[PDB]
Design a protein around this ligand. Structure first.
Ligand SMILES: [Mg+2]
Ligand SMILES: [Mg+2]
Lengths: 162, 162
């Protein structure tokens, strides 16, 4: 394993952050292999570079238009000379905002392989990172009756008016 | 690749579910290699079978005592003859309850390698799976002022009395 190997894997996170930020689905998908599994936070499964690009272009044009990503490496480890794991911290600023929304905090795991064509992402699980405090809040919420939950969601709706 | 290979990887999810359910940290850690990365939902990093076992025994004795896991395979794919990805659905019933708490819904990704010693889990990212509806609720919450958030958390606390 080289310094070159490690630099290539790390660069994937920057390639993606920057492509998201300029709204490029193809840029975002570029590090991925043609067979890669991409799993989104709500359990959507995208299969391969092309699907990953198509899904993200559409998203950048609609449901995350105007959002901004920021992020950095949490760890990179080589399992062997042809396989690495990389965990990355990602945060999201929603449009019109200046700060990141905790609701979007993510800690994706990248599974990177060095094949015939060199390093590519073969798997990525992108999930939400919850704080313990947010976890207990959700536990509490789910423990409430549907009627009590509705009081809570109604209060949230009335406050966002408002 | 064999049927045997696939059966071995799948069995890991059952080994873990059953060990959790009988409160065995060593049982839960057994499928893992001595170098494996385990990342919990709030970003805790456990390194290797022994740490994974020590952490989980302590948890089974305290903060998740009396919880029950249920789960099933979502997909298994072989990248090559020595590397597989496996996504698993996990749900949790909190003690005293008969139903699973949505707050605990998880979709872990297992990274499995076939080394000198045969199949072992080398990486696992365990995160919370959010529905789109829960995501938008959290986005709404985080968009509120701290004072509005406090009204919401106070209401939740008053309802769980109650
Ligand atoms: Mg209920
Ligand atoms: Mg604010």
């Amino acid at each position: 394993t080289t310094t070159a190997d490690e630099s290539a894997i790390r660069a994937f996170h920057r390639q993606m952050i920057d492509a998201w930020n300029r709204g490029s689905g193809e840029g975002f998908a570029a590090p991925f292999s043609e067979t890669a599994d991409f799993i989104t936070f709500e359990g959507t499964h995208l299969k391969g570079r092309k699907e990953i690009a198509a899904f993200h272009q559409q998203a950048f044009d609609t449901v995350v238009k105007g959002t901004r990503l920021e992020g950095e490496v949490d760890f990179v480890r080589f399992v062997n000379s042809q396989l690495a794991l990389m965990l990355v911290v990602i945060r999201v600023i929603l449009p019109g905002q200046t700060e990141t929304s905790a609701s979007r905090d993510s800690l994706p795991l990248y599974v990177v392989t060095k094949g015939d064509e060199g390093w590519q992402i073969e798997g990525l699980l992108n999930t939400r990172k919850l704080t313990l405090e947010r976890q207990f809040f959700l536990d509490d919420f789910d423990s409430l009756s549907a009627e009590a939950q509705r009081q809570v969601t109604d209060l949230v709706a009335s406050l966002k008016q408002s």
